[PDB]
Structure formats: C-alpha cells, structure tokens
Amino acid sequence: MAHHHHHHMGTLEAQTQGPGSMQGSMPSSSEDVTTLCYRVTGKVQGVFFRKYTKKEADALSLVGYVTNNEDGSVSGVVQGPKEQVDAFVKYLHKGSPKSVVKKVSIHASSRVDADGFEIRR
C-alpha cells in the first residue's frame, strides 16, 4: 500500500508603520535648560529613523540638531528640560528599532543654538 501525505502553510501580511507630526521649542533662560552633545555608534545595517527620532523630540519638546557622520556614528546635540533630555538619552539607549547600537557617547557641552534633527549623509 503506497501512501504519501501532503503539506501546506500560509504567510503573514505585515504593516507599514506611519510617522507623526508635533513640535515643541521655547528659548528659556531658566537654570533648568540643559544641553548635552550626543554621539552614538551603530551596526552597518540601517540608518537612524529620523521618523521616531523627530517624533521623540517633538513629543518631549527637545531642541538641538542631529546628523550622521562619515565615521558611521550618528551625532548631534540635545537641549531642553533636564528630564526631557533624559527622556531622549533613554530613547538613545534604545536607538532606532532596526539600528543595532554599538555604543552611546554623550558630552557635557553647554547650551548651543538649535539647528534641526535630520540624519544627514
């Protein structure tokens, strides 16, 4: 009695996650206005999602500027309330979902004038 059995499976229809749009910027003189320079290193796989980065900054109302470097690392400066800068660095510890961050590096640099968050290449 010859008898063979079949096999079959399906697939998964994924989704494209959209962006958002907010913004928060105030030039203050209060002692609380904090500023630190950011520089993160990443795996050579994919660039930093300006999407989630700017959404983060816009939501928590951080000002400053971000860009990618020929060194490979993504650098910039964050300014704003101490705790929101904290929020951003905590975000930076996570990085972009598809960017395997190697090492994060921050710098004590005092208040600068904001320019814009955009992974320039």
Residues classed as catalytic:
50, 68
Strand partners, 65: 77, 116
Please report where in the chains the tokens 């929020």 appear, as a residue.
87
Give every CB contact of residue 79 below 8 A, 6+ residues apart in sequence.
Answer: 33, 34, 35, 62, 63, 64, 85, 111, 112, 114
Backbone angles phi, psi at 100, to 5 degrees: -70, 100
Query: Residue 85 in contact with residue 19, Cβ under 8 Å?
Result: no
